[PDB]
């Protein structure tokens, strides 16, 4: 697509979120960079309202799928870059098992050379001493598969996945994500065949930062579609032995 | 700084210029808005005296650096917002290679909620069939780096950069900009370490406007100062592999 | 309009008011200047009869909408300047919630180079220990939106807005303003589409003034009408990325 | 080493090269996978700039020695995996007999789960009708031994080998490779005793690919170090006969 | 066959096994070499998961019949080499008399110059104090005949034999092997007449190895098919005496 050309190098990223969880209001600003050639995101988020009232790991998915590394053979399945520069609206309902839920609406688009993710989040029905409001999540993050399918009717995609959040007592808190992305622009977009994004995330702290923050390193790679290269490598293995 | 708080949302902008180039007198009024969070300027300029006697692109730099997006880690280097609301005086000498020069003096300050840029410009020594008076510039604009350094003696900044104006025959007309900014107020200002502003500008016409005008979309982002985040991301990459 | 040409520079202002509130008679003279290009008013009012018998903030709205800054794209909606130099009659009923009311009639017109506002005010039904006669208003002023609509039948405008006056105990005293303006002259006037004036006011005292007085700084800007510039800036953002 | 644990399964590979040979600029992107347990590489390279200006076989060595199968008894001699995940810099000078030379600098390191090989190549002094610029190489590849020795002073290895490129007229074009690898990380690395890598490569084309490309299947196995197992098998042969 | 040409010299071998016996999980990696001209295998196996939970001799048959020495006159009966390089699937059920059973599935094929045997094994119904889980087998191995017949329907072979494992108390533990081999490739294979492989195996330990391991020396020779050479030697004996 034409949109994929906007991601050939390192792109600066800006993230802005306004949130309200069980009436606790907060805002977060994030900055970093994305390098889609390597599916690499390097970001730092700062809570601009003081102390974040929920654990940082619960917001990782909310805080840039246009930076996924799509293998060459899957390039016709990259809806995210195809929607650029006009961007897409990313909407989610996130259900925390045995607890409350987050509802999010984000606009992801270019503002000049900067890729901007602007989000509004609302959390309701959280338990006072649940894993979220009780701050029982470990400050770490598992690897996951993000399942994507085309939504022809809406000229977009439907996305589903389940995040496993480690809890301090060795248990796991599931967060079932229901997501949809729709293009902002009027131009054609790529509607993909079913596939997934394999994600790996690491969380850290900046030792010189006094504000409540999160440093995130993420790697995102598309997979799940093949183009029969295995048969060609098997044929090459057969022809070599036949000559040697 | 306290001045940076004045730029958290969208700010209306008013630009007023009185000019005289080789004795040709003209005035321009501009309106728009600035959103420093995104380093975004959206402006429309109208020549109120009839036909502008110089090409619109030659005046782009003269017609709002307080709207630059300064990354969080560079916030102590933003002289422009720190001088607000009292504002700053922005003075330039602009040398058009092999041609005349512009000398400008502007006061940039708030008038209530409106950020106002009031300018006087004088152009001398222009050649009758040069690129400027001969109107040989294309109606477009390149991206540039604006170099900033502190001027401790004047409690301000010195700024230097070279604009590349495309000419209709494929050649380029350089415009070397020498600039200084000094605060109007008595309060403390931020004197920055050396850095630059990366600028991108697009020019257009309003299809329903009959007056001589210019529509400008500009993105301005500060860069050139780092705070060693690369080493932290490298350490995160090393710790993940060590655990996985 | 032809009337708008009378406001291109700084215009001296004279305000004269004769008032009677619950039988307490007073007079006020004000002087200052208006700069409609910046929507800026700088005025000083002196009570010429001794002590003002009502709080100064209650009279701010009574004491110059012809000085509003109308954006270029809204210039066909500026009734106030279009009525000049002949001027307009500005009439109001101001209801102080749970208290009395003011009725005012003013003539606003040029007398040579001076813009003059001559007012008669009558206040009735005020409570002895209400916020007004009890002098319980703080000496400050909030920002408001002044709603304007055309009154085709009267060749003028109807204006409505609600002032929030802060009270010393943290409560707010509302003052609902009902206003009409009719031209004095026979010439054509501009009848506007619905819009509003965004106002900001600051109150102070002259440290060298011994008379009962008020120093006022006000900024007035018209808003509420757009001319689809957002679509043009979105198209410019789309064309730049398509070329870069 | 700890680095060897990163190679127990199939690892996705990304190769990126920017090249300039006698002023002819080109870029190549490659993808595939490596399975070090079997010393197996399966890769596909695409010239992203159009037609590759040199024969594909000349670039095979430039386009992943960390995927060599090291026999268990030689595991203390595997410098390549020991440098991971931080990686190593691989530098070469490649002399084409009676013709020009290539100079290359590559960084090989993990980016999340992906093993990335980023290369810059510069070729100079090539003859217009030599085997390289004259495109006289057959599209095939011989088997070779890659000689490795420790470079204690640089905490790395020196590598030397000679590639035999078949020419269309039955002659052979030699390419003498001089190579050095140095670790990027600060951690300890394995400095090996002298040994070699035995390589076998097959080249093919993807029948559904219209871009200029190369499909490569490579097998790499370390050899040249023994741990006296022959004497143990001889002793077993002697003890069996002595009992039977 | 064409496959037999791949075995004229010494071939490196890699063996990989993942096993689960009565829920005890383990993995084994083996390396060595095979010389089919002499029917000779020299291998060393290492348990990579720590202590092997079953006696090493029970796994000997699971851990390369393509290395059998087939006499020249029986070369048309060598199914194993004829299936190469694509390889064959070797499946077994092994019944330990009065005890549990192993079920195995292996793929034996070339990966470049290396002959690879990849196996999955599942053992069930073993007695806690039986000869296997009670570790009562001696660390030695008897000689056996491996009976082969064609399986025309499956384009492969059926193999049957009974292993005699010596027990520490002088008794013998039988292991009845039921085996089938099917080609992986689409090319023609040799379907043999009934014959057998005569096997001899010796087990030892590497005196410098601290990991749980087994050193194996095996000789495998095909027999059971003659081509009437005895009558020719009898005729030669008769003709010599008739002349002398």
From Swiss-Prot, chains A, B, C, D, E:
Effect of residue 95 to S: In alphaGFP/cycle 3 GFP; improves folding at 37 degrees Celsius, reduces aggregation at high concentrations, and increases the diffusibility of the protein inside cells
Highest rank taxon of the organism: Eukaryota
Effect seen on changing residue 159 to A: In GFPB; leads to enhanced fluorescence at 37 degrees Celsius
Description of post-translational modifications: Contains a chromophore consisting of modified amino acid residues. Maturation of the chromophore requires nothing other than molecular oxygen.
Keywords: Chromophore, Luminescence, Photoprotein
Tissues expressed in: Photocytes.
Annotated phenotype, changing residue 65 to L: In RSGFP4; increases fluorescence and shifts the major exitation peak to 489-490 nm
Consequence when changing residue 198 to F: In H9; increases fluorescence at 395 nm excitation
UniProt effect for mutating residue 144 to D: In Cerulean; leads to improved quantum yield, a higher extinction coefficient and is 2.5-fold brighter than ECFP
Quaternary data: Monomer.
Name of protein: Green fluorescent protein
Gene: GFP
């Amino acid at each position: 697509s034409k949109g994929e050309e906007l991601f050939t190098g390192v792109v600066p990223i800006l993230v802005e979120l306004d949130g309200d969880v069980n009436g606790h209001k907060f805002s977060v600003s994030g900055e970093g960079e994305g390098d889609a050639t390597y599916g690499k995101l390097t970001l730092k988020f700062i809570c601009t309202t003081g102390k974040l009232p929920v654990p940082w790991p619960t917001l990782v998915t909310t805080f840039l799928q246009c930076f996924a590394r799509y293998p060459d053979h899957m390039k016709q399945h990259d809806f995210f870059k195809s929607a650029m520069p006009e961007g897409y609206v990313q909407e989610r309902t996130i259900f925390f098992k045995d607890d409350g839920n987050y509802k999010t609406r984000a606009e992801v688009k270019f503002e000049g050379d900067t890729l901007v993710n602007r989000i509004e989040l609302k959390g309701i029905d959280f338990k006072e001493d649940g894993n979220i409001l009780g701050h029982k999540l470990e400050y770490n993050y598992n690897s996951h598969n993000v399942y994507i399918m085309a939504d022809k009717q809406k000229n977009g995609i439907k996305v589903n996945f389940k995040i496993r959040h480690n809890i301090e007592d060795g248990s796991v808190q599931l967060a079932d994500h229901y997501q949809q992305n729709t293009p902002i622009g009027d131009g054609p977009v790529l509607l993909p065949d079913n596939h997934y994004l394999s994600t790996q995330s690491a969380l850290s702290k900046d030792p010189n930062e006094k504000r409540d923050h999160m440093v995130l390193l993420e790697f995102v790679t598309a997979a799940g579609i093949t183009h029969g290269m295995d048969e060609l490598y098997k044929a090459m293995a057969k022809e070599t032995a036949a000559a040697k």
